Design a protein around this nucleic acid. Structure first.
Ligand SMILES: [Mg+2]
Ligand SMILES: [Mg+2]
Ligand SMILES: [Mg+2]
Ligand SMILES: [Mg+2]
Ligand SMILES: [Mg+2]
Ligand SMILES: [Mg+2]
Ligand SMILES: [Mg+2]
Ligand SMILES: [Mg+2]
Ligand SMILES: [Mg+2]
Lengths: 37, 215, 174, 122
RNA sequence: GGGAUAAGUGCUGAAAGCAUCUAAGCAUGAAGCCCCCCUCAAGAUGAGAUUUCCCAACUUCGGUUAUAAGAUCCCUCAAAG
RNA sequence: UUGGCACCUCGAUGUCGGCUCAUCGCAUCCUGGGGCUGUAGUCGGUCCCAAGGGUUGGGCUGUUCGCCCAUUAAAGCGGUACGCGAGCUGGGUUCAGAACGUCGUGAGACAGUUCGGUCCCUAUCCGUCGUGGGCGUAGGAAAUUUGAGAGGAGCUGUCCUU
RNA sequence: AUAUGUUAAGUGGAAAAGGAUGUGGCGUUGCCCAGACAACUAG
């Protein structure tokens, strides 16, 4: 989890979705987990 | 469980096992015959009320309160025992058993059943600041005229009030207090007293209701 | 919905007896799972029970697939019966049983335990590999997650409870 | 009790003769002490020779404080001198020949090299 | 010891035939919130509840009264002050 | 915090530190829960949710601040008239004495030092902490009580077993 | 009240740079039952 005011796909395997609160991005490597928090 | 209603008489020491000395408060627990009980069918809380030390007969010219009255006559005729002086609820235990008009016992407990204790305080009159609450006094020398009064109470005029709950000099007071988890070192039957561990509130020839623990 | 006009089946000797809004699939492997799925209209005539409503609502076009897929989750498991496994890794583990209550020894100070539920045939058919069994896919995916949550996979050596086949990550260490 | 800045006729054969306690180490805000605790302390007097020297902060166990101690039967041991033993930070003393009869209470706190090295222990 | 959650982790699942913790459902999850512990509290005018005791003549109830039950005035003190 | 503006107060709104006593935010110091680590374990970095409770004794200077010693689970940052003198000291700052450097030909001057320097009040009303009399509670009285509500308490270390 | 729509956050009922498959009426264009874009098996 990385809180940040900007979410961009860090690599091209990282999908961009929406969840209960925010605009979480989910990827297959556990260094790319952001939220627009 | 089995709330007896004893009164104190003092406090002594009793040598337990191998070397251990344990201080003991001796509680005289006189007769306790159960008056009426009240349940959920009648008006809604399952309880047993218990009497304590009796007094003489009724209705001549009640100068004191060691004589009864037409209220407590018929309230105590219902169980057919002598009128009472101390009646206490026990909504702790046992709506099923404890038939009305039964003396309870003194040996409901065993030497090792942990108990609780409810009794009134001493009460030390009207006392002031650094004796009632744990506040510390001022300097007694180097010129200070602030020995023992309480200090400031509130801020300046962005709070133009003093907040309630302020711990100021009032009466020290006898209000109730409950220690928890005391134990019974020894039970007597024939002299009709018990013992407890440590020390309970409420000065000599007082009143203290004890009951089972809630650990 | 792309699974809109894509009714699954009604292939069984079971009977999807609709009432109120639900069904009760009274079938071979299990007896009559039931849940009132939604407020959507449907047809149940002879061979392929289908569903359709008055379309073009982006709150109801998404609400389609929450109704079709449930009536494929229900009738498929009561026909067959399906659940996943859990192949414990490393050493130290010895997952025994005590009836329906299976304990684990994954190196802690004390054995862990669990109390399985009805319509979920708890099974441990190996020396140290487990495998759930049950009827309702949503109901059996819980317990297979609930025994992952004892010792999740330690990402250096690989020790810990995993599913059957999945790519768990590996980080080298010292 | 022994607290912040007491002065103690130490009992060891290791050069110090009087020490003073900076802190009674233990819990937070610790104030008092009695037999079996450990205090940190800096020497003032010094015997010529010895081991330690004047102005050296050393850690040191407490032995035989002036007020009593209540062992669990009802007894009391009141001595007549505050005293001390300088420890090696392995719960053993420096020298060998500590004087001055020692209370028994410092045994559960594994000080047992002091007790065997001592005269009459109560 | 309980009940719902925040961060987070999950199962099932379309929108968007795949994935996907979520949109409708189902979990779990903290010295934190409420019930539990002790203390006060029916002036809570929304004035609650049980048991027990007492019930009359003047008289157009104007109640004139004069009492019960139960208190109190007044005294000897104190476990209270 | 350092300022800018001059809007209220000169028919007086007492001014720095410290003791007494608190009360409130969270941008969190410890403790509780997680993600992520260029995380072997024990330690550690960084970020999210979280105010329930804790937050030390001494030397130095008037000190604030600061450095230093010994600890602790930690020695948090702030507001509350830079909280609190009709509750307290007066050490400095802002009173008359005197002196030193210095500027002024002189009287004298100095956010430069330096020694000595009076701190007033019996509580009306609100606010508090206790504590009693009248009346209400559709007949009077005693005893025991239910609990809408409201207060109180909430902290942690070290050793041993696996 | 009437008629057309819009938003699902209490926005209405106090903030920007930026971030984003939120949601509507709008326009252009290249992929097309000869059958893509979802998915299978080949190198
Ligand atoms: Mg300003
Ligand atoms: Mg102007
Ligand atoms: Mg004027
Ligand atoms: Mg004026
Ligand atoms: Mg003045
Ligand atoms: Mg926060
Ligand atoms: Mg706080
Ligand atoms: Mg000095
Ligand atoms: Mg000159």
């Amino acid at each position: 989890m990385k809180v940040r005011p900007s979410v961009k796909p860090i690599c091209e395997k990282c999908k961009v979705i929406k969840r209960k609160g925010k605009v979480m991005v989910i990827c297959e490597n556990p260094k790319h987990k952001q939220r627009q928090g | 469980t089995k709330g007896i209603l004893g009164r104190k008489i003092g406090m002594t020491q009793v040598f337990g096992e191998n070397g251990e000395l344990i201080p003991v408060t001796v509680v005289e627990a006189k007769e306790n015959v159960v008056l009426q009980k009240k349940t959920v069918e009648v008006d809604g809380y399952n309880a047993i009320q218990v009497g304590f030390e009796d007094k003489k007969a009724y209705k001549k010219d009640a100068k004191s309160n060691k004589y009864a009255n037409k209220p407590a006559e018929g309230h105590a005729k219902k169980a057919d025992a002598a009128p009472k002086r101390f009646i206490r609820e026990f909504r702790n235990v046992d709506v099923d058993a404890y038939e009305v008009g039964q003396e309870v016992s003194v040996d409901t407990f065993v030497a090792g059943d942990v108990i609780d204790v409810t009794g009134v305080s001493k009460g030390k009159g009207f006392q002031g600041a650094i004796k009632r609450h744990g506040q510390s006094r001022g300097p007694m020398s180097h010129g200070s005229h602030f020995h023992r009064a309480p200090g400031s109470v509130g801020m300046a005029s962005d709070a133009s009030r003093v907040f309630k709950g302020q711990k100021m000099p009032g009466r020290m007071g006898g209000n109730t207090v409950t220690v928890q988890n005391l134990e019974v070192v020894q039970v007597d039957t024939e002299n009709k007293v018990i013992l407890v561990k440590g020390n309970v509130p409420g000065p000599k020839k007082g009143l203290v209701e004890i009951r089972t623990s809630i650990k | 919905s792309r699974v809109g006009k894509k009714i699954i089946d009604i292939p069984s000797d079971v009977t999807v007896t609709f009432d109120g809004n639900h069904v009760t699939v009274k079938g071979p492997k299990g007896e009559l799972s039931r849940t009132l799925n939604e407020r959507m209209t449907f047809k149940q005539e002879e061979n392929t029970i289908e569903v359709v409503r008055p379309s073009d609502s982006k709150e109801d076009r998404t609400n389609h697939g929450t109704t079709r897929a449930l009536l494929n989750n229900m009738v498929q498991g009561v026909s067959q019966g399906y659940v996943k496994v859990l192949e414990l890794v490393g050493v130290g583990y010895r997952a025994q049983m005590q009836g329906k209550d299976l304990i684990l020894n994954v190196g802690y100070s004390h054995p862990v335990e669990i109390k399985a539920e009805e319509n979920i045939t708890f099974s441990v058919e190996k020396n140290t590999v487990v495998k759930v069994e049950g009827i309702s896919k949503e109901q059996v995916g819980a317990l297979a997650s609930n025994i992952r949550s004892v010792r999740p996979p330690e990402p250096y050596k690989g020790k810990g409870i995993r599913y059957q086949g999945e790519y768990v990550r590996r980080k080298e260490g010292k | 009790m022994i607290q912040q800045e007491t002065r103690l006729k130490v009992a060891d054969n290791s050069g110090a003769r009087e020490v003073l306690t900076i802190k009674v180490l233990g819990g937070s805000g610790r104030k008092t002490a009695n037999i079996g605790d450990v205090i940190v302390c800096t020497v003032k007097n010094a015997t010529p020779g010895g081991v330690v020297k004047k102005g050296d902060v050393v850690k040191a166990v407490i032995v035989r404080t002036k007020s009593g101690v209540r062992r669990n039967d009802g007894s009391y041991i009141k001595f007549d001198e505050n005293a001390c033993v300088i420890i090696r930070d392995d719960k053993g003393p420096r020298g060998t020949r500590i004087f001055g009869p020692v209370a028994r209470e410092l045994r559960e706190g594994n000080f047992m090299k002091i007790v065997s090295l001592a005269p009459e222990v109560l």
